[PDB]
Each structure stands twice: as structure tokens, then as C-alpha cells.
Symmetry: C3
Subunit: 174 residues, 3 copies
């Protein structure tokens, strides 16, 4: 019959200890056997996987590595730590606009890179906006920016999943 195409861009978001990493890793294993694990944790799993460490400028580093042609698909862990890193790389973390600009540029670069990707992507991000509004301006800035980044990625993504207690709700499916 007809050969179905899987999803090109998948966003998995959820709260702390919600199973989003394991669910996204299952998605990535569905991509194939050779998976590019782009880890964003600030530094200063299946045995067939390649781990590319990249705390910032994910589009630049991932494109330069040329590894998109080497893998079956990519799992990005995680938009949360990327947004925080972007906040902490700024001159004044109490000032929102420069952090917002840098983060929006990072997310748009990632979106553009994914549009050209020959392999599919699953991205992991956090939901941080359903608690109480914090007092310090810096924490509110981080929350706002992460929300904006998730909005951008979910608009571009083909599938969006909201993890609750290890179980996925479908927020968007092609």
C-alpha cells in the first residue's frame, strides 16, 4: 500500500519527574538505531547513540558537526536548560529584553535547522507556568522566556505531547 511518514518535529513537555525524557527517548528509538542525543546541560542510554554536548547555539553546533547526516534522528535534552543557560549568559539577568531576544534567536535558529533536517527531531522542554507567580523579576523573566520558547516550538512542531505522571496527552497531531 502507501508508506506512512512519521512525525518530523515532536515536542514533549511536562513537569518535573513526569516521564518526558523516557517518552522522548522511546520516540527517538522509533526514529532508528543511531540517534544524536544533543544534551544542553551546562558544562564548564542505548549503546548505539552519539552524545553531542552543546550548551548554547544549538543550531550552529549541530549544523557544524555534520552529524545530521550520520544519525537516524535527534533528541534534544532540553529546552529548559537551554533557556536557563541563555539567561545566565546575559550581562544583567534581571533585565528581560536581552534575554528574550537571545532566547528567541536561539529558538528560531533551532526551528530553521529543523526545517532543513533530513532526520526527525524530538525535543524535551518543561512546563513552569502553572504555579504561583514568583516575586523576583529574574525568576519571572525565566518563566516568561521558557513559555515563549515552548509556544514557538509547539507552533512549528508536527506533534506536541503533554506528559502527566508518565502518560502522554496529545496536544497536537498532524
Amino acid at each position: 500500500g502507501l508508506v506512512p511518514r512519521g512525525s518530523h518535529m515532536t515536542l514533549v513537555l511536562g513537569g518535573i519527574r513526569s516521564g518526558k525524557s523516557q517518552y522522548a527517548e522511546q520516540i527517538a528509538a522509533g526514529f532508528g538505531k543511531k540517534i544524536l542525543y544533543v544534551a544542553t546541560a551546562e558544562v564548564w542510554r542505548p549503546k548505539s547513540w552519539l552524545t553531542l554536548e552543546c550548551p548554547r547555539h544549538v543550531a550552529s553546533a549541530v549544523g557544524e558537526s555534520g552529524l545530521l547526516d550520520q544519525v537516524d534522528g535527534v533528541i534534544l535534552e532540553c529546552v529548559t536548560l537551554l533557556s536557563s543557560n541563555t539567561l545566565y549568559a546575559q550581562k544583567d539577568p534581571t533585565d528581560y529584553e536581552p534575554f528574550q531576544e537571545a532566547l528567541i534567536e536561539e529558538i528560531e535558529a533551532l526551528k530553521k535547522l529543523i526545517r532543513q533536517s533530513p532526520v526527525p527531531w524530538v525535543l524535551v522542554s518543561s512546563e513552569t507556568g502553572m504555579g504561583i507567580s514568583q516575586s523576583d523579576a529574574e525568576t519571572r523573566h525565566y518563566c516568561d522566556g521558557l513559555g515563549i520558547a515552548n509556544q514557538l516550538l509547539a507552533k512549528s512542531a508536527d506533534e506536541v505531547y503533554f506528559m502527566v505522571a508518565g502518560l502522554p496527552l496529545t496536544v497536537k497531531k498532524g
Copy 2:
């Protein structure tokens, strides 16, 4: 839809979604406001929309203005600040029972007004209960009261949408 509750976390797109719903109501829209980011929605409001400021007693002011007969529909922004105003308008914001009574009365008045309203209403509220329970009694009370208010509005409303990363989930549809 006659009554729609759109609620979501911080920077979840709930305002934009409710504004598109309200634009779907018509061109003459009553923006009932209950209050960097205010200067983005002020400088974006359709000039055929009428913005009525009403920090408390929303049913009273909206009924007295007689504007229900002059507009195509209503957008309430937002139940969150209504809950906070009601809490900090109490004699002792650390005592939960009177604040709950005042807020329940406010919400029931709004519900009654909407049942008898000739135009449809879309209400925006926040989800604040899915983080860690904060220390000060006022914050816990505010969380509790907003939760109760959202429960009331969602039960009476015809359609309820839960925003995740800019995308609406249907929690209730007629």
C-alpha cells in the same frame, strides 16, 4: 458558544486565544479588564473594542453600564487578578473563609449575569495549583480561591479550554 473559559499557565497564549475567540464574537467587543507586558496588549487592542476597567464587582459594573446591549460579546481579563483583588480587599487576607465567601459571591454574580447576558462571554483565568505549595498563608489562600473560582466558572461555562504552549486542549465542549 455562550460562555467560554480559557485558562492556562504563565505565557501559555491564553490571552491571544481568548482575543481571537472574542474577535470571532464580532467587531464591537467589550474588553472587561480587572487589573512591560501590559504595553503589548494595550498597543494592540482593536479600536472598535471598548475597554471597561472594573477591578471588583464585575457583574455590578457590567450590568450598570448597559453595554451588554451595545457590543457583540465580552472578554474578561482576567479571573486571576479578580481573585487577587478580592483577597487583598479583605480585612485579613490571612483568614481564608471570608475571602472565599467574597470570591464565591463575585463568581456567582458573574455566572448569573452571564446566564441572563444577551451576548456571549469569554473569560481568561490562570492555573496556579500545579507547583509547590508556598509558605505564606495569603499565597495558599489565593491559590485555593482561584482554584475554586475556576471550578465554578468551568462547571457553569459551555466550553473550557486549557492552554498548553499556545495550543488549546478542550476540557469541555457542549
Copy 3:
């Protein structure tokens, strides 16, 4: 007609009332396993609306052990557990060092696994109440981070074992898993 149901949601999300409706669907004689240890307004308003045919067993820790010891599973139509949130809080505050995560995680996982076993052998159905606490901002206290992680892990286990899982939003349940 579900054997194990997890109802979870945020603060004041209607999860207690929804789980109580589920339990009333179980039957008329319900074992209300309460884990709170005393806030008075919550408990008062909850007890007020409790059916007089329900048996309230207060059990702050070792829920599986205590419920088995009470022998009350053979006296009721079903069980409502209120709530996994305070069960985890109790487990955290019963440790020597609440800033040390691993012993707390071990204690909570053992509690949950015992509860799971008891539910597997239970002659009556169970509806469990838990909270969502992980979608706010990452708190500062290490004890708070441990509590959040542990409750999340506990909810993951319970939802994996459960037959039906519901996520309350503003009093209305979304189905996350249905038999």
C-alpha cells in the same frame, strides 16, 4: 467499573470531589484511608460531606501494612486513598536527613510498591488521590526539590499500575488512561 483509579490534579482542582464520586460508584461502604496528620478547615469541610456509611482509617505512613492489618478490606465496597501527596510528605519528614534524597526515595518507593501489591490482592477497588506539583518554578530548597521528585516518581508508579487515570483541570477530568 475500574479496579485501580488515580485521580491527580493541582491545588483546588476538584480531585477530591471527583474521586469521592468514583468511590460512591464503588458502593455505599467505603474505606476512607486518610494520610493527613494534624489545615483544620480542609479536614473539617471534607469530613462534613463524608457519607455516614464510610469508615475513615487514618494512616499517615505504611498504608499497605496498616490497611492489611485492619482487615477492613473485607468490610467495605471500595477504598479511597487521600492522599499520596501527604503520604510522600510524611515519608520525607520521617527521615533523619530530609535533605538527603536517596533514602527518602527508597522509603517512598517501598511504600508505593507495598501499596501496589495490596491493591493487586485487594478484593475491593481503589481510587487514589494525588497532586501535581511539578509544573511551577523550580524551588530553591533542596528538601522541596526532593519532595517534588519523589511525588513525581510515586505518581508515575501509581499511574503505570492504575486502570484509569484522570487529570483534573478546574474541576473537570481529562482522561489520561482508560481501560
